[PDB]
Amino acid sequence: MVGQIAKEMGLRAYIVGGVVRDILLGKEVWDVDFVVEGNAIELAKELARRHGVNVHPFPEFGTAHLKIGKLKLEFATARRETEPASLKEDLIRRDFTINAMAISVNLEDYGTLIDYFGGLRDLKDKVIRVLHPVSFIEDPVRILRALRFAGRLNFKLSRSTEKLLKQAVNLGLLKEAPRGRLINEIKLALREDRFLEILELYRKYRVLEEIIEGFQWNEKVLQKLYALRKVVDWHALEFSEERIDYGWLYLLILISNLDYERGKHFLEEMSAPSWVRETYKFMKFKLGSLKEELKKAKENYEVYRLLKPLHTSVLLLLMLEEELKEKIKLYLEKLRKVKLPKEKIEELKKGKELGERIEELKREIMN
RNA sequence: GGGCCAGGUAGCUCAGUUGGUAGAGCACUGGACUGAAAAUCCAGGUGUCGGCGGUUCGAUUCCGCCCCUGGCCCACC
Incomplete structure (x- = not known):
């Protein structure tokens, strides 16, 4: 019409x-x-x-x-x-x-x-190409966008466009550009499924160093990103009903070795979800001691205690460790499976003592 | 039209976390009080703590999708 x-x-x-x-x-x-x-x-x-x-x-x-x-x-x-x-x-x-x-x-x-x-x-021809040489000068944000697109559609920047992009970044146009536009562009980026490749393009053209203060690229963080990729694949494979936003995990891995001040500042400007902030604040400090505790875990009930209160994201971060991988897995597809019949439960009730008793019964079942 | 932060608790105005049996100040019923009324006294409703599912023995709380209000945000490719 x-x-x-x-x-x-x-x-x-x-x-x-x-x-x-x-x-x-x-x-x-x-x-x-x-x-x-x-x-x-x-x-x-x-x-x-x-x-x-x-x-x-x-x-x-x-x-x-x-x-x-x-x-x-x-x-x-x-x-x-x-x-x-x-x-x-x-x-x-x-x-x-x-x-x-x-x-x-x-x-x-x-x-x-x-x-x-x-x-x-x-x-x-699968090519990301700017319309005119002045393109990235007009809107520096496009830089990110370019990479983002090149990430999603699996396209390639033309030599022209590549030189122009590199020139644009080398002139430090990324800093002069409006902060909100950039932050929102990254927010769009992490919602892509191919966002990892977009992070590879962010690594190649080193835009994150310009946008984020104090951020640097090493091999450990990268390999951590790939391990997180595999973990995300498996988790979104079997447990897919439990899916949450994965990109924020990658974002946490990127800011992992970064200072807590600039980290909280970044999550502040990014308007990240609450559980993301919880996961990060838990990662910066409590994560190490938690890992140590999971290493000391012998009985399955202690594992239950050190896991169940945590979110799914935390458990996904715990799958980074090879030693804890089969343990977290066993926690997911096995360690929680249970129920109880009527008469027995009614006898369990014959305040908090009911809950304590229930937990005693569960730990009686596990080990 | 897309993000988030909040705020969502009575009729109005507002607090409340290790999940465990809910609160204030003024209106509401009922009775003592009165020629009637109010003040005031005794008390006690002050409520599926947004809507709907899920996890849990148990969800105002954990998580997911939606309802409303307000502000910050991008608002193009």
């Missing part, structure tokens, strides 16, 4: 940006971004009115948002910067070639891919 309304209003609308990429990559998304030649606000208003839904206008930006079913739609007026702007001008201001394309929703040309800069070829 969008093409019909665009027909009536004498306008031209196009699906634009990452969405198009995801369409050509086959990935389905419920977030659609439109670029309109002419007024996008009226298009959004009318479209929202016909489907009988609410609309959220933004006149100052010249954009509007509306939600139809599971679809989240954003209509944006074509602009030449971050006189009427042509679609080409709206596309030329973007980051990468694969992100610079468009698909016409206009009825006559409907189903046509609009690609000026050859983003189709770069999507075909």
